[PDB]
Symmetry: C4
Subunit: 388 residues, 4 copies
């Protein structure tokens, strides 16, 4: 009908309830399930769907061998019904590529896939299921994007891309699209030193993205975007509760405008909801590997450099594998406020479970409740020995 | 369009005709069929569908091992087209959980799934395919619900939950929802001593639920609900024709307000249509196990403590397995009265058939006819030796 | 929109062109294809579909063993997209039973399935996908129907049933339904001595059915029905070109009102288009088994007892298996006249091919052309040795 | 809504971006994928789909043995969602045949399939999914057509057929259809000596087809059609950059009205976009086999007999297999001009890869960009050793 506008604020998050779970690897042990990674969730005005980058083979298929590799010509952004597994028969291909983002602006959906050699990649923006705009690599070193949904406001959907080194200063740009066309683009501003895989959400006409400093920070960079003025700024989450992975142990005081040193050249896509006292951070439990997952209420994490948790909820136990995590919200749900949601990628196979030759994942997603619900852990559930 | 109102009374039930049957286990022997249990049937204004709690694996899949277990993080309420089997590719996930109920109010469908640890479970009410309300456990001992459809009247859909001991007094509540929000809730009233898995239907602005006293009764408790006044009362079916399982042999006189003693701490979800002389009870043929299934016309069973059958129809022979059974009706069918219907879960595998390591089921459902149709038996049809 | 009326006459049939073919057995050798038999084709105002009675198992599945049996509780009328195979995932169940018919009246579709023991069978009429009317067996000996589509005119859809002996006089009735309700029923009139599996079509407000005299006739009985007056009459096709199977060799002169003697207690469902000089009969090539299939133009076959073919077209070579065949037409196609169509069931497995333990079929269907198209043969195409 | 009119001209083609890729053979190694060949892509006003001629068996199925054969009764034109593989469950059959073309005129789609013995083949034209017109063979030697989409203008959709010798003069006709009926047909005019498998596109009320001279030309014939006047003319592409296969090495000067001699009785379906300086030719890299694929910008190739490439883009490396290629465009995309697109069939199996007994393909398709995008190669991706 009409372009969606971010007119509400977030609901109070007192706990998280189970939203969707696909049990993809359990089911894929004996069904035609596609090998995937880098999944996310994204809603249209009438339906919410699971998304991920397919590897172009089933798990049980012989071509699953080698799916630890990130970029190839056999990957594609696919979407499928909520809580179903990504099967060969119920999956819709959005575009061809090895990096992506996608969002509905209220009228229709824009999907962006990037493909190519490391030094000659290109992004093709699809709108209403047709290619509309194409952007060629500007730094010649793996043009890449969010790996989770973008957000729009009155037709304008900002998207964060990064081109260049994964372990040094790189060239990050914020593009502002409207109906698939580029309205404008900015170079990154503010104090964030490196940006990768931003996880975004919007409320009260402002867009907040929590990204990943793959270079030196263990605290996460944040990009606040103004989709009307088409401007932005960046900094790091101030809290000592560190959310990247691998990372050092939490200190007593964090940093607001500099990376917190400790681990270099590594990380994991993550997110956060930054809303004053209504602030919740997500992180792996393990400081060493992508293992376990918990949500921690850390009042004013963004600005208070000594903020510590006042409440929490375990999502995945530290004995189970986790992986990427990002934000999304059903901006079209009935109600007075936006209900915050998130997904966690549960990676199985290589590199941790080396008995199999593949790497794939299942998904678990939750949404906030104003109630204080009891907690449960939500692991992948597959038994690797069944695949040997 | 508009909220459905229970304006008709039941049609005369002179016999039962075959409505739907999925042959899930026969077909699943060589197709990607999901392992399920606790199925039911539920209609929308334009289509009737099969529902059940998936175990998150196919029957032939290696993860089918162990599906005798009731609660895990891999279960989900799924729905699929009438008479089709629950396959990985044609199944729609309604919500994540190990206990459920669902009903269409005329405008849209409300689905409720409960998940969690035994001591910290929670129910999340979905309406129009979005989470709306969440209720946390109140007795800390397996919050659970109907396992068959709820019923609505003018927007109000009562749902019966039980939290606490399965073998002692517990805390049962009747919630009255309208568009996913709680309008009110009551503690159980009347003489029923224990309530579990209520099977409900509605006619002439009143809702009747036949439940299961898992503690001491072999006669079944009934809850009559008034969805306008939002009040209810309870008692037991008076008839000596006992319908729980396991149960003692039928006596010559039954009890109206007390459990009929004999078997303790066990039972099976069942139902009945209580309509004066137009009364039919369903029960397993075996008094010892969930074996066989028959419908018996027992005039005034609800109130006459010496009522005995005047007619009957065998649905499943006593040599074949049965299981749960519940009521539903297509409240949107053309016609002068509501046609009573029911389904029977045909459980295969553990515990009775221990040669396989899984537990699953198929479904058979019938609806009433005003004609006196000839009868046939409707067993599952799968040959277990084919799975060894 | 509105009830369809048979306002046109048939187009001139100068040859037959390929309409649809599913290659079900070839494909089912390595796909989840359902075992079927007794197929047919039937159109709705916006789509034409393949129909058949499923055996409730896939071909490669272990339960395929024994599917030579006609009646069981695992059969169901299913429909699926034109030229696709009947797979577990793309098949829609219409009703449960081992004998059926179905037709669209212009507003919606009526489907009828019969199920039960041989002596207590019953038909349940579904209209707009809901059960509406039920008819119990009247002769207590396998109540059965057409096995191909019925035809409607202004809301009224006559259906021919037979109850009683398959090899003696039986009780055949013509029911006239309108919106699933019985308007009236007649006992068979005219000179036909036995009626089974009628194949019907309609033109210029009249319905013609070519059936099967399983008792003594090798010439086929015809029932002409007047759907407005709700009356009918019957006779046999006069031509010496015999179309039942097994049958004697063609004589020089046929019979109009008596069965042509020769083979007793056997036959095959077949059809014909009887339209003066525009008359075409279908028959197996073999007089001994269901082998081969050809269409022969026999001017005035219905009334001329010495009529012989003036043109023909081979559909299936005599070295390939055939089986049932029936008529249907897309009454909603654009055009000045109705294009005659037909399907042939290509049976594979038992009894002829005894190396496998199953019996199933694929379908080939053609429609008339006013052109004189070249011919090709259309066999099933599967290699039985691949299933051993 | 209304008939589509070719009112725009082509967009400037500065490079090609990835549009769709199905990875059919990789996926089919462990999924129910149909064996195909002769694929193409074609759009409707609201969706673009992949098309191909199925062989009526899956790749892993035993009937895949022998699919190197072109014509049989088990082939059918099928369509399926863009970038999905042609699976048994997501594929829609358009018509039965071993040669085809299809196009949407703006209101609905016309599909044409040809089937039959070599000497008695016939084409049946379907419009709005119903058979409408039938054409019988005129030269009695494999009546055949485009193998890629046709194009329409104001209701009129010309289609090029060829009947007769594949290695001598034959009888080629251009039929002009409107709503499935023949408005008129012409014998081929101009200087083209032989025509096979034309690849067409339209812009500014004119239709251009690049075909294949299977007899003596290594330069390609072009047919320009005027869909309003219903007339046409033909010639050869003048450029020395030869695009058929197998072919001689490029000379310094080409021929405009005669076949360029060198290879006889062979070729491959190909295409080109002829638009003055905005001209791009597609060709296999290898001059000997269907190996590799590249696009070359050759300004004024159609008329300049010494034109050579000024830019290029490799699509498939010469170490990977290619095959047929053709044109299509989404005539319903938003925008000021038509974006040129094309697909390449990536053939795997026989005859080149003789270790397997089947022949099948996957598809890669690209569309033009006004940007100068970096390039990547897009091979099939399957490992044949996995099928042994
Ligand atoms: C029924 O359900 C309810 C609702 O869920 C249950 O109640 C909830 O119970 C939760 C579990 O206790 C509770 O969460 C906890 O909340 C406290 C604040 O009150 C919070 O501090 C906890 O978080 C710390 O603890 C967990 C491990 O327990 C850590 O994994 C987490 O990271 C937090 O500690 C780490 O960081 C802190 C800040 O930097 C450090 O001070 C601390 O030392 C620790 O650091 C080490 O570990 C880090 C992680 O590996 C590492 O990075 C660092 O370097 C150090 O090595 C936790 O969130 C909920 O608040 C509570 N909710 C409610 C409403 O009550 C109830 O139990 C259930 N009922 C039953 C019968 O079970
Ligand atoms: C064509 O189709 C028609 C239509 O279906 C057929 O006609 C129908 O035939 C039915 C079968 O005879 C008939 O049903 C019976 O109806 C009578 C009342 O008329 C009813 O009493 C029967 O029910 C008792 O019998 C069955 C076993 O036969 C029991 O399983 C059932 O539970 C009932 O008995 C038990 O409970 C009674 C009440 O408490 C006790 O008095 C009795 O002893 C027995 O108790 C023991 O068994 C219990 C069950 O295990 C146990 O819990 C208890 O502790 C005791 O151990 C049955 O419903 C239909 O009424 C009739 N319908 C019509 C319209 O006529 C016809 O046969 C078919 N035609 C052909 C040729 O076959
Ligand atoms: C390109 O395509 C065109 C178009 O299709 C081809 O032209 C067509 O060619 C057809 C084949 O010749 C031709 O069909 C024949 O038409 C004649 C009438 O003109 C018709 O009589 C033929 O039918 C008899 O013959 C076939 C076997 O050839 C039998 O199977 C059939 O049943 C008919 O014979 C049987 O019944 C008769 C009547 O009772 C008996 O007189 C006769 O003896 C025979 O009886 C025995 O066999 C019976 C069957 O088993 C059995 O029941 C009985 O007891 C006896 O044992 C046939 O239909 C088309 O008319 C013609 N169409 C056109 C427009 O020309 C052309 O060849 C193709 N081009 C090329 C190069 O091939
Ligand atoms: C990032 O991406 C960009 C964008 O793609 C890259 O830049 C592009 O790089 C392309 C590759 O160099 C370049 O394409 C080439 O363009 C030139 C014109 O400038 C064109 O001549 C090239 O085509 C010839 O060369 C290829 C092999 O290189 C041949 O396969 C092709 O057929 C052409 O040569 C053949 O035909 C000619 C004409 O007849 C003959 O003169 C020539 O000898 C040759 O003939 C033989 O081979 C034939 C084929 O087998 C055979 O039939 C014949 O008989 C003879 O045996 C090629 O298209 C793009 O123009 C350029 N694009 C842009 C915008 O710059 C950049 O490299 C990437 N960045 C990085 C870091 O890699
Ligand atoms: C830092 C995150 C993105 N990068 C670095 C890409 C890069 C490598 C080398 C040089 C420059 C850039 C990653 O490797 C991501 O890592 C991970 C990962 O699990 O950490 C998976 C992503 N599939 C991958 N992204 C891409 C495009 O390959
Ligand atoms: C009495 C019916 C519900 N209960 C008891 C739950 C309970 C156990 C122990 C203590 C308290 C409560 C059951 O076990 C039901 O039994 C059966 C059953 O077949 O009898 C299957 C149901 N899947 C299960 N329900 C749940 C939630 O697990
Ligand atoms: C004559 C056609 C219908 N009959 C006879 C049914 C009957 C048997 C014995 C006594 C009375 C009636 C058939 O056997 C048909 O035969 C055949 C067949 O291939 O000849 C298949 C049909 N599936 C079957 N119909 C039914 C209902 O079983
Ligand atoms: C020249 C292209 C079409 N022909 C020649 C048909 C023909 C043969 C012999 C005599 C006359 C005509 C082809 O063989 C095409 O070749 C090829 C091919 O890969 O070259 C595949 C096509 N499936 C096939 N077309 C048909 C209809 O069979
Ligand atoms: C969003 O705001 C714009 C004007 O700023 C308005 O035209 C549009 O309809 C609004 N969207 C909705 C969904 O109301
Ligand atoms: C149900 O009754 C309410 C008023 O009590 C009415 O507004 C509604 O339309 C009724 N529903 C239908 C389906 O008529
Ligand atoms: C069929 O005829 C009836 C009246 O006899 C008419 O009301 C109906 O609309 C007609 N059907 C169509 C499709 O015109
Ligand atoms: C099929 O069943 C029969 C009888 O039930 C048995 O002897 C036969 O061996 C079975 N065939 C196969 C392949 O299992
Ligand atoms: C195409 O042109 C015809 C008239 O020449 C017109 O009637 C039709 O609507 C046009 N099509 C569109 C899509 O405008
Ligand atoms: C395929 O068929 C040929 C000839 O029909 C046969 O020799 C060959 O072995 C078959 N190949 C396989 C793998 O079955
Ligand atoms: Ca980091
Ligand atoms: Ca009990
Ligand atoms: Ca006979
Ligand atoms: Ca050539």
């Amino acid at each position: 009908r009409d372009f969606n506008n971010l007119t509400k604020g977030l609901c109070t998050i007192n706990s998280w309830h189970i939203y969707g779970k696909d049990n993809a690897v359990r089911i894929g042990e004996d069904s035609d399930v596609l090998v995937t990674r880098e999944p996310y969730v994204s809603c249209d005005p009438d339906e919410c769907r699971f998304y991920a980058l397919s590897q172009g083979t089933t798990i049980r298929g012989k071509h699953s061998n080698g799916t630890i590799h990130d970029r190839s010509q056999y990957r594609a952004l696919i979407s499928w019904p909520l809580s179903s597994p990504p099967t060969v028969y119920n999956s819709r291909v959005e575009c061809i590529g090895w990096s992506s983002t996608s969002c509905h602006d209220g009228k229709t959906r824009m999907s962006i896939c990037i493909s190519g050699p490391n030094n000659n990649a290109s992004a093709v923006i699809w709108y209403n299921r047709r290619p509309v705009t194409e952007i060629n690599t500007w730094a010649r070193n793996i043009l890449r994007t969010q790996e989770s949904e973008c957000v729009c406001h009155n037709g304008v959907c900002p998207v964060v891309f990064t081109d260049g080194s994964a372990t040094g200063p790189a060239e990050t740009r914020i593009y502002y699209f409207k109906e698939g066309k580029i309205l404008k683009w900015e170079p990154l501003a503010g104090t964030a030193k490196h940006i990768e895989e931003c996880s975004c959400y919007g409320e009260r006409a402002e867009i907040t993205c929590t990204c990943r400093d793959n270079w030196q920070g263990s605290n996460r960079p944040v990009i606040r975007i103004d989709p009307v003025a088409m401007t932005h700024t960046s900094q790091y989450i101030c809290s000592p509760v560190l959310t990247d992975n691998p990372r050092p142990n939490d200190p007593t005081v964090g940093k607001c405008n500099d990376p917190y040193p400790g681990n270099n050249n590594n990380g994991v896509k993550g997110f956060s909801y930054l809303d004053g006292v209504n602030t919740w951070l997500g992180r792996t439990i393990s400081i060493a590997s992508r293992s376990g997952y918990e949500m921690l209420k850390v009042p004013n994490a963004l600005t208070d450099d000594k903020s510590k948790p006042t409440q929490g909820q375990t999502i995945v136990l530290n004995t189970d594998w986790s992986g990427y995590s990002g934000s999304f919200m059903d901006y079209w749900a009935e109600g007075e406020c936006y209900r915050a949601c998130f997904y966690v990628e549960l990676i199985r196979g290589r590199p941790k479970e080396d008995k199999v030759w593949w790497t794939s994942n299942s998904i678990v997603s939750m949404c906030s409740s104003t109630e204080f619900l009891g907690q449960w852990d939500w692991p992948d559930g597959a038994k690797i020995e069944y695949f040997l």
